[PDB]
Amino acid sequence: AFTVTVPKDLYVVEYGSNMTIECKFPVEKQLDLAALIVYWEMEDKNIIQFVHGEEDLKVQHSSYRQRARLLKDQLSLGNAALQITDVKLQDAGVYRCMISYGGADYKRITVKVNAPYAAALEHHH
Amino acid sequence: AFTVTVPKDLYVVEYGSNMTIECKFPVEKQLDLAALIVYWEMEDKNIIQFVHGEEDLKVQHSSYRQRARLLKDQLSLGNAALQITDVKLQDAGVYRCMISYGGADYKRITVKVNAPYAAALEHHH
Numbered sequence: 001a002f003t004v005t006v007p008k009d010l011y012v013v014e015y016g017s018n019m020t021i022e023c024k025f026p027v028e029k030q031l032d033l034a035a036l037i038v039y040w041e042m043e044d045k046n047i048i049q050f051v052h053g054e055e056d057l058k059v060q061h062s063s064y065r066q067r068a069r070l071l072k073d074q075l076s077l078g079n080a081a082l083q084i085t086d087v088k089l090q091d092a093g094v095y096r097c098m099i100s101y102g103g104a105d106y107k108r109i110t111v112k113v114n115a116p117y118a119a120a121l122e123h124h125h
Numbered sequence: 126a127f128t129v130t131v132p133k134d135l136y137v138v139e140y141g142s143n144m145t146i147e148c149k150f151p152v153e154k155q156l157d158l159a160a161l162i163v164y165w166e167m168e169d170k171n172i173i174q175f176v177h178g179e180e181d182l183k184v185q186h187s188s189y190r191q192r193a194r195l196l197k198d199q200l201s202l203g204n205a206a207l208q209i210t211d212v213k214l215q216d217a218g219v220y221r222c223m224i225s226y227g228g229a230d231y232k233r234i235t236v237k238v239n240a241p242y243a244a245a246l247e248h249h250h
């Protein structure tokens with residue numbers, strides 16, 4: 001009954017730009033913030049935890065500090081949108097949006113990051 | 126808040142033995158089966174899915190059929206206990222118990238499998 005869907009399972013973004021990863025879940029009538037739980041994570045590193053209508057950055061992995069936010073306006077439309085500003089090469093990998101809202105589901109989203117030689121060279125060292 | 130806790134985040138088991146990995150969640154009074162969702166997985170392979178008060182093996186990976194059980198007696202005590210009999214080296218890796226019940230959380234559990242040379246040689250192909 002409850003299915004999470006992702007329009008894009010793959011994103012190809014540029015180094016230093018901003019990215020928005022979308023993750024859709026059904027909302028029948030009006031959004032029950034008390035029943036919504038949203039988890040954004042990549043490779044066992046927690047990015048976002050949204051419970052009771054507020055972000056919890058107490059468990060956010062340090063590499064995503066000051067750069068990751070959940071677009072709360074899109075939530076009432078059934079869209080868990082993760083925005084990452086200043087995309088780094090470390091941001092490449094497999095992301096997971098986990099959503100609980102009556103039912104529970106999750107989806108994987110792969111991010112590849114293109115970079116110029118200088119940025120890639122610094123990441124390599 | 127609603128938090129899933131695991132007594133042991135690491136299990137060290139012997140090849141061919143049976144293991145039971147525990148995953149605790151709070152129950153206010155008596156377990157409301159209609160509101161409970163239990164998801165067990167290791168490394169993107171589904172082991173157990175408990176929805177609507179019934180096991181769902183429709184997405185269970187073939188390796189875990191007839192070899193994995195959710196102890197339903199422990200569920201009413203707030204313990205989603207996954208029992209895997211005849212542990213193989215392929216069972217080593219990162220497990221996740223995902224639980225939705227008036228809230229949502231999950232925990233990771235690492236299983237290491239000790240095996241004699243013969244079992245390792247067979248796994249080695």
Ligand SMILES: Cc1c(OCc2nnc(SCc3cccc(CN[C@@H](CO)C(=O)O)c3)o2)cccc1-c1ccccc1
Nearest residue numbers: 009039098099100104105106107108164223224225229230
């Ligand atoms: C999320 C969750 C639960 O979940 C239940 C469930 N039902 N079903 C599934 S498994 C989906 C699946 C399978 C295989 C491959 C994928 C990857 N998606 C691919 C598609 O192949 C892609 O689009 O790239 C995806 O879990 C259960 C309990 C709690 C929670 C929760 C915890 C914390 C926060 C919020 C909620």
